[PDB]
Amino acid sequence: TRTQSYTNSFTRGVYYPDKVFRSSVLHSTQDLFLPFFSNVTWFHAIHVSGTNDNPVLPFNDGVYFASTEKSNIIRGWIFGTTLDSKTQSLLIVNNATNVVIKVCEFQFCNDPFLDVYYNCTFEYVSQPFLMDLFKNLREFVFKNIDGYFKIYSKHTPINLGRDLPQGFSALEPLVDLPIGINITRFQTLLAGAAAYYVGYLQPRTFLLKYNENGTITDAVDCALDPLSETK
Amino acid sequence: TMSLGAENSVAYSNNSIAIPTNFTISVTTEILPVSMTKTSVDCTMYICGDSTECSNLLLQYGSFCTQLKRALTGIAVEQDKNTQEVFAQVKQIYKTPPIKYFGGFNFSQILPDPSKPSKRSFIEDLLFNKVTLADAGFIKQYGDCLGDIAARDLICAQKFNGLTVLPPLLTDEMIAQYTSALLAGTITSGWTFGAGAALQIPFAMQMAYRFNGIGVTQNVLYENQKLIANQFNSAIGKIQDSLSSTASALGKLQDVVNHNAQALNTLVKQLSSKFGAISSVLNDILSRLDKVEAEVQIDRLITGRLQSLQTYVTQQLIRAAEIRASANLAATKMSECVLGQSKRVD
Amino acid sequence: STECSNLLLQYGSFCTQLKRALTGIAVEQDKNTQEVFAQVKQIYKTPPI
Amino acid sequence: ALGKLQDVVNHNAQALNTLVKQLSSKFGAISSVLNDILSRLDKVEAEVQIDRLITGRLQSLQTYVTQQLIRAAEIRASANLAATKMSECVLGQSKRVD
Amino acid sequence: AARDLICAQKFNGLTVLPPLLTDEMIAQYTSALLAGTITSGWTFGAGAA
Amino acid sequence: CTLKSFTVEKGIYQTSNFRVQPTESIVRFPNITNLCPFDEVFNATRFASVYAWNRKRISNCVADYSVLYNFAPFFAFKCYGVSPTKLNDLCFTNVYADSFVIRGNEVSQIAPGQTGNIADYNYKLPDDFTGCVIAWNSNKLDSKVGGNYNYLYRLFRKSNLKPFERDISTEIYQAGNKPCNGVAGFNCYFPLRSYGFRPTYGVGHQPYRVVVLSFELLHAPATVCGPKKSTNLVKNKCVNFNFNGLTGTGVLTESNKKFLPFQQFGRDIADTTDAVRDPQTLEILDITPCSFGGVSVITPGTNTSNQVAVLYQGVNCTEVPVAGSNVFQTRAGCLIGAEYVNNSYECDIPIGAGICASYSIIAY
Ligand SMILES: *[C@@H]1O[C@H](CO)[C@@H](O[C@@H]2O[C@H](CO)[C@@H](O)[C@H](O)[C@H]2NC(C)=O)[C@H](O)[C@H]1NC(C)=O
Ligand SMILES: *[C@@H]1O[C@H](CO)[C@@H](O[C@@H]2O[C@H](CO)[C@@H](O)[C@H](O)[C@H]2NC(C)=O)[C@H](O)[C@H]1NC(C)=O
Ligand SMILES: *[C@@H]1O[C@H](CO)[C@@H](O[C@@H]2O[C@H](CO)[C@@H](O)[C@H](O)[C@H]2NC(C)=O)[C@H](O)[C@H]1NC(C)=O
Ligand SMILES: *[C@@H]1O[C@H](CO)[C@@H](O[C@@H]2O[C@H](CO)[C@@H](O)[C@H](O)[C@H]2NC(C)=O)[C@H](O)[C@H]1NC(C)=O
Ligand SMILES: *[C@@H]1O[C@H](CO)[C@@H](O)[C@H](O)[C@H]1NC(C)=O
Ligand SMILES: *[C@@H]1O[C@H](CO)[C@@H](O)[C@H](O)[C@H]1NC(C)=O
Ligand SMILES: *[C@@H]1O[C@H](CO)[C@@H](O)[C@H](O)[C@H]1NC(C)=O
Ligand SMILES: *[C@@H]1O[C@H](CO)[C@@H](O)[C@H](O)[C@H]1NC(C)=O
Ligand SMILES: *[C@@H]1O[C@H](CO)[C@@H](O)[C@H](O)[C@H]1NC(C)=O
Ligand SMILES: *[C@@H]1O[C@H](CO)[C@@H](O)[C@H](O)[C@H]1NC(C)=O
């Protein structure tokens, strides 16, 4: 029910570091970024039938999630340290017309899934974000800094049909939460033919290029090679 | 490992000599900087951004804010002094007679063309086009900076912080008039217009004077006049072809322009530094903190910006001394080579 | 020192312009040596006698 | 005879020896040792002392760079004179007096 | 046992770069100039020797 | 006055710097109507324990910070980043209130850059904190003669605590090689001790109540803004402006800048705010500085005459803010008081770009 492959990331995972408009400028920033040409992991989750192991992954300072699935097999995420009703556990569920975020201490089984048509210091009910129904690639960045959970989102249609394509796509900031939780492990949710890409962020210095319309169209990772260090 | 040059051995003997039997006429190009950009810095507006609470604390820091302006005024005066010393070396504006037969020598590429809106030569137009002028003077005129995309221009961003550029005293038309007067006087008289009143002489006899100066009898000229004229015309054509082809010959002038732009860009980008304060915005500091804490952070930013301004003025003074040395050299070059024949080697 | 470096990062481009000035001086020294000594195109050698 | 060249070498050594010996100054701080300051004081007071040391050492470095720029200008003028003397005296014969 | 001043300079971030033209090559330039002057006079300063 | 002398020689002198004064003042704040419930934070029946310090989110209301002195007798009002008398002028996005009870000798641990027992195990503040810490003695409300054991604090933890993190776990701390297996004993400590909090205790061991107001700076559209009425919007005029606590002076124009919906401010090369979003109508306003420039004085010597021509540097001659007879437009700018003449002479007083002036004062 789990298959691991490894592939390249190219120049993917660039997000807006702040909510300040900048146009036609080369801006140097330092943040938790996905490194260029990194080693991202492809996961295939296959169930034996369309009815109604240890696949828990480490968090490791931010997670770049990517999906090319047309249908809504991926429904949400579970974050936490132990996840056995001994500490707080962040739970993000994506409904059809809602999104629910909790830190309830109640635990689930070792193989978590969302069935069809199916103490808590923080609660967050809001408008959902999975309208991206070409192959319609969806990218997300989760990070946890100073008790703040930051979720960055982007939905771009692709036409090459070969994994993560070449090019640049900036991720706009979506969700900020003052939950204040220790996170070292996470897992995904399923409703099986799921396939998704996972990468890990590192503290890196980037040089972003803002064009005439204020869009990050190009970037340079300063610690990739001496040419980009010279740049 | 680099190559010093091709190895050669002179075939020396105590009874053997080598004598040339022919010659060639070589016209080379030498580029010398004369002046640079006349910047001016609004000290109070650059430090404080039109803030009364900042300016009252800036008044406690003595006369640095005035002596920097005095030094920049002295630099801006001596730039025009350098340009006047190099170019204004002739008392009267001479001009070429309309008949342009100077013994077969073709001076059409260096004499001015009256069909142009500005009376410059073809080579002068090529030299003007091969250098990309940035911050030429008061070209924006405080009217081109009121836009949105035009406000994103670096000249408007440096203009809104009190860093302006004064125009040169002599325009390019007047500099071209000086070079045209010097060229016409040289062609029609030789060195007599530099020694005193201009004395007319045919260009064949002037070339005979120059060859007798360099140690060659004048019959070599008077029997090789057409060959010498053809060699000079071919060399002039080679210079104009090289100037039309390669744009990397004018390195020094482009370096002067790049340094004058880069110093102002660095001085503008130094305004974003915190210098140990909580923020780099004086309005944000004054809105956030109280009077005493605002005084502390404003004093920190004042000290940092004053140090940055003093660094800029010191760099400009050193560069102005280097430019003045080059301009004195170029004035010596013109006085000893355009107005006469030089015996100094190389 | 990480804390000293993080406090030094707030002081601007002083290090960059100082390094640029020293690099210009270091290039200028070799330019001076080249323009003084390299005035001959071909390396001549003396006859043995 | 070679006192000019010896003075060039001595100036270039002295300008670095002074820069090395300037690291022992306190500039009003409690100590000139950065690890001693970081081990003794907490975050805010240590930041104050480190800011004082940073300002003093940056001013010393800027003074050294300015003096080196002036010395480089003087050496460049001397090199231009030496190049002119090489071009005129060696490669030809000069009629200029003295 | 005795620490060097150059080691104290290098331990604090101050470094001396080597010149581009080495002394043997400077001596080769002066040898070429001397041989050209002796075997040709000033004629190697205006063209071929 | 510039030359500090009573006699002025002939020439041009960089004397003054003119600037267009602002006309009026504009305030622009979001139209929120609710009042922030600080009474529920301060005037409570009892406060939570420090290892379970209580966090309350305050948003979408008008916050008055001058009312806090009424219903709570405090003296420790240590504010980092923002002065407490300037809290009503500017305004934030979201406010957080962290309430707990701490002993009087540990209030100094509630500060950025401090470590100890509570600052490492119970409540940790970030080093870039922008907020306020409020503490007051509550011995009469939290002191019992038999000992008050309702307030608990963490004493043992495997690692230090990251800022703004709550740890309410009850696992037994293992201080030895043998495993505790959920049973306390030797080298197996319950990590949650309790205070005594007796009224007969000396001061400094007496119980204290602490509310920490954590402020979020202006990056999102603001939801918490205090009492300041918003005036009408004035465009195409040099005015003073206030946008959600950001103060400036300039001209507000309509802009075609394409702000993304998460953006609120738009900045420059020199880190100055030059584009704003209106909090009441979502207009993309552009900020330009008011008209300014340099003023030079062209005069002969005071031994000759006292007549003065004025050169406004850079401006167009239609840009000069009057309230002139002779007005000339040069590449340097606008010349006022010198009559242009068609003749040509030697340059007496240089002006710029081939124009000179000489003594009435003529320009040629
Ligand atoms: C990404 O990482 C994985 C493992 O972390 C790499 O897989 C290894 O590949 C080498 C050579 O193909 C094998 O010898 C190892 O046994 C593999 N490791 C595992 C755990 O299977 C993979 O090659 C990396 N990707 C790239 C592009 O280098
Ligand atoms: C968050 O939880 C993790 C557990 O996943 C803690 O990491 C453990 O720390 C102890 C001591 O520091 C180590 O002995 C364990 O090996 C760690 N476990 C793992 C999986 O790394 C961590 O200390 C907690 N706190 C923070 C601030 O991250
Ligand atoms: C001296 O050199 C010139 C050129 O440097 C010679 O002129 C050329 O002579 C050849 C002979 O057939 C002609 O084809 C070329 O057209 C001439 N060039 C020019 C520019 O006129 C000249 O012949 C040489 N004189 C001697 C005596 O050898
Ligand atoms: C002097 O030089 C000019 C420019 O090189 C010559 O003019 C050229 O003549 C040729 C021959 O007809 C034309 O093809 C070119 O178009 C002309 N160029 C220009 C710029 O006019 C001129 O012939 C030369 N000789 C004289 C006596 O003037
Ligand atoms: C999820 O959506 C279904 C139908 O779209 C609805 O009946 C249900 O109440 C929703 N759940 C939540 C928590 O909003
Ligand atoms: C809420 O958490 C506390 C933690 O002490 C626990 O004792 C209690 O049972 C929880 N309530 C539930 C699970 O309903
Ligand atoms: C900015 O947007 C406009 C309108 O959408 C478009 O015409 C223009 O090409 C864009 N700029 C760039 C650099 O693509
Ligand atoms: C706190 O609230 C109670 C009732 O809600 C009231 O009786 C009491 O006076 C209040 N305390 C203060 C200090 O205002
Ligand atoms: C109040 O604010 C909203 C959104 O900013 C705006 O649509 C509305 O017109 C405002 N009301 C008034 C009376 O200005
Ligand atoms: C001044 O204004 C006029 C009309 O307003 C305009 O045509 C001109 O370009 C401007 N600038 C100068 C330098 O005259």
Quote the minimal CA–CA distance from C49 to chain E in Å.
12
| Amino acid present at A200 | Y
Q: Which residues of B259-274 are buried (b: 16+ CB within 10 A; e: fewer)?
A: bbbebbebbbbbbbbb
- Residue A124 parent element (H or E): strand A123-126
CB-based touch D/B (3+ pairs, under 8 A): yes
Please name the member of B318, B325, B345 whose beta carbon is closest to the beta carbon of D69.
Answer: B318
Residue that is written with structure tokens 């805010």 in the block: D44
List C-alpha distances in Å: B184 to B58, B98, B189: 56, 11, 8
What's the CA dihedral at F146, F149, F153, F154 to 10 degrees? 110
Determine phi and psi for A207, rounding to 5 degrees: -115, 115
| Amino acid present at F130 | T
> Domains of chain A: which residue ranges?
2-231
Q: Using only the alpha carbons of chain E, give its radius of gyration.
A: 20
Contact F333, F344 (CB under 8 A): no
Contact B209, B190 (CB under 8 A): yes
Q: For chain C, how many residues are written? A: 49
- Of the bound ligands, which one is closest to the alpha carbon of residue A144? 2
| Amino acid present at F269 | I
Nearest-angstrom CA–CA distance, D70 and A158: 60
Chains B and D: how many Cβ contacts under 8 Å?
A: 24
Contact F118, F153 (CB under 8 A): yes
Residue that is written with structure tokens 């080369």 in the block: A26
Nearest-angstrom CA–CA distance, F286 and F270: 16
- Residue F256 parent element (H or E): none
Which candidate, B307, B311, B309, B304, places its Cα nearest to that of B279?
B304
First-residue to last-residue Cα distance in chain A: 45
Most B CBs within 10 Å, among F27, F77, F272, F311, to test the B interface? F272
Contact C11, B273 (CB under 8 A): yes
Contact F340, F361 (CB under 8 A): no
Nearest-angstrom CA–CA distance, B307 and B300: 11
Contact B247, B130 (CB under 8 A): yes
Contact A170, A213 (CB under 8 A): no
Contact B343, B102 (CB under 8 A): no
B225 is written with which tokens? Answer: 């006049």
DSSP reduced 3-state for E42: coil
First-residue to last-residue Cα distance in chain F: 29
B317: nearest CA in chain D? D70
Contact F264, A19 (CB under 8 A): yes
Q: For residue B256, how far is the Cα from the chain centroid?
A: 7
Residue that is written with structure tokens 């000035």 in the block: C21
Interchain CB contact of D77 with C (< 8 Å) = no
Which candidate, A80, A69, A82, A78, places its Cα nearest to that of A43?
A69
Show the ligand 8 pocket: residues with CB < 6 angstroms.
F 43, 71
Please name the member of C8, C22, C32 whose beta carbon is closest to the beta carbon of D75.
Answer: C32
Q: What is the largest CA-CA distance in chain E?
A: 59
Cβ of B314 closer than 6 Å to ligand 4, yes or no, is no
Contact F246, F32 (CB under 8 A): no
Contact list in C for residue D46 (CB cut-off 8 A) is 3
B169 is written with which tokens? Answer: 């005293």
Contact list in D for residue B346 (CB cut-off 8 A) is 87-88, 91-92
Nearest-angstrom CA–CA distance, B263 and B257: 10
Quote the minimal CA–CA distance from A112 to chain F in Å.
24
Residues whose CB falls within 8 Å of the CB of residue B240, separated by 6 or more in sequence, listed in order? B109, B122, B123, B126
Nearest-angstrom CA–CA distance, D73 and B320: 12
Contact list in E for residue C44 (CB cut-off 8 A) is 32, 35-36, 39, 44, 49
DSSP reduced 3-state for F215: strand
Number of Cβ within 10 Å of residue B214's Cβ equals 9
The upper half-sphere exposure of residue F73, i.e. CA atoms within 13 Å in the direction of its Cβ, equals 5
Answer yes or no: do D87 and E45 touch at CB < 8 A.
yes
Which candidate, F327, F291, F330, places its Cα nearest to that of F309?
F327
Residues whose CB falls within 8 Å of the CB of residue B307, separated by 6 or more in sequence, listed in order? none
DSSP state of B14: T
Nearest-angstrom CA–CA distance, B325 and A208: 42
A208 is written with which tokens? Answer: 């972003």
Nearest-angstrom CA–CA distance, A94 and A106: 18
Which candidate, E18, B79, C20, places its Cα nearest to that of D69?
C20
Nearest-angstrom CA–CA distance, E8 and F253: 60
B202 is written with which tokens? Answer: 């045919």
Rounded to the nearest angstrom, the distance between the alpha carbon of B182 and the centre of ligand 4 is: 23
CATH class belonging to A2-231: mainly beta
Residues whose CB falls within 8 Å of the CB of residue B237, separated by 6 or more in sequence, listed in order? B109
Quick one: CA dihedral D37, D38, D42, D47, positive or negative?
A: positive
Nearest-angstrom CA–CA distance, B107 and B229: 11
Answer yes or no: do F112 and D42 touch at CB < 8 A.
no
Contact A116, A52 (CB under 8 A): yes
- Of the bound ligands, which one is closest to the alpha carbon of residue A100? 5
B23 is written with which tokens? Answer: 């010659």
Q: Interior CA angle at B48 toward B45 and B51, to 5°? A: 100
Show the ligand 5 pocket: residues with CB < 6 angstroms.
A 95-98, 100
The upper half-sphere exposure of residue B36, i.e. CA atoms within 13 Å in the direction of its Cβ, equals 28
Residue B53, Cβ density class (10 Å: 0-12 exposed, 13-18 middle, ≥19 buried): middle
DSSP reduced 3-state for B236: helix
Strand pairing category for A172-177 and A99-102: unpaired
Q: What is the resolution of this structure in A?
A: 3.3
Which candidate, F120, F113, F97, F117, places its Cα nearest to that of F105?
F117
| Amino acid present at F309 | A
Q: Sheet with F54-58: list strands edge to edge.
A: F54-58, F95-103, F207-215, F131-137, F76-80
The upper half-sphere exposure of residue C20, i.e. CA atoms within 13 Å in the direction of its Cβ, equals 10
Which candidate, F353, F328, F354, F331, places its Cα nearest to that of F339?
F328
Q: Which stretches of D20-70 are assigned E, i.e. beta strand? A: none
Please name the member of B311, B318, B345 whose beta carbon is closest to the beta carbon of D88.
Answer: B345
Nearest-angstrom CA–CA distance, F235 and F251: 7
Number of Cβ within 10 Å of residue F264's Cβ equals 21
Residues whose CB falls within 8 Å of the CB of residue F342, separated by 6 or more in sequence, listed in order? F364
Q: Where are the alpha helices (DSSP H) in chain A?
A: 226-230
Answer yes or no: do C43 and B8 touch at CB < 8 A.
yes
Nearest-angstrom CA–CA distance, B225 and B235: 15
List C-alpha distances in Å: A178 to A130, B23, F98: 22, 87, 12
Pocket residue to mutate for ligand 9, from F230, F278, F280, most atoms within 8 A of Cβ: F280
List C-alpha distances in Å: B95 to A147, A217, B186, D96: 82, 58, 10, 35
Dihedral class, residue B337 (left if φ above 0, else alpha if ψ from -120 to 50, else beta):
alpha
Which residues lie across from A73 on neighbouring strands? none
Contact list in B for residue F19 (CB cut-off 8 A) is 50
Residue C12, Cβ density class (10 Å: 0-12 exposed, 13-18 middle, ≥19 buried): buried
The closest residue, in CA terms, to atom 20 on ligand 2 is A184
C48: nearest CA in chain B? B12
Q: For residue A158, how far is the Cα from the chain centroid?
A: 18
DSSP reduced 3-state for B312: helix
Which residues lie across from A124 on neighbouring strands? A101
First-residue to last-residue Cα distance in chain B: 29
Nearest-angstrom CA–CA distance, D59 and B307: 9
What are all long-range contacts of B146-152, with beta carbons under 8 Å and residues at least 24 apart?
Answer: B146/F288, B148/F255, B148/F256, B148/F257, B148/F286, B149/A212, B151/F274, B151/F286, B151/F288, B152/A23, B152/A24
The number of helix segments (H) and strand segments (E) in chain F equals 3, 24
Identify the chains in contact with C, defined as 3+ C-beta pairs within 8 A. Answer: B, D, E
Nearest-angstrom CA–CA distance, B81 and B30: 22
The number of helix segments (H) and strand segments (E) in chain A equals 1, 17
DSSP state of F301: -
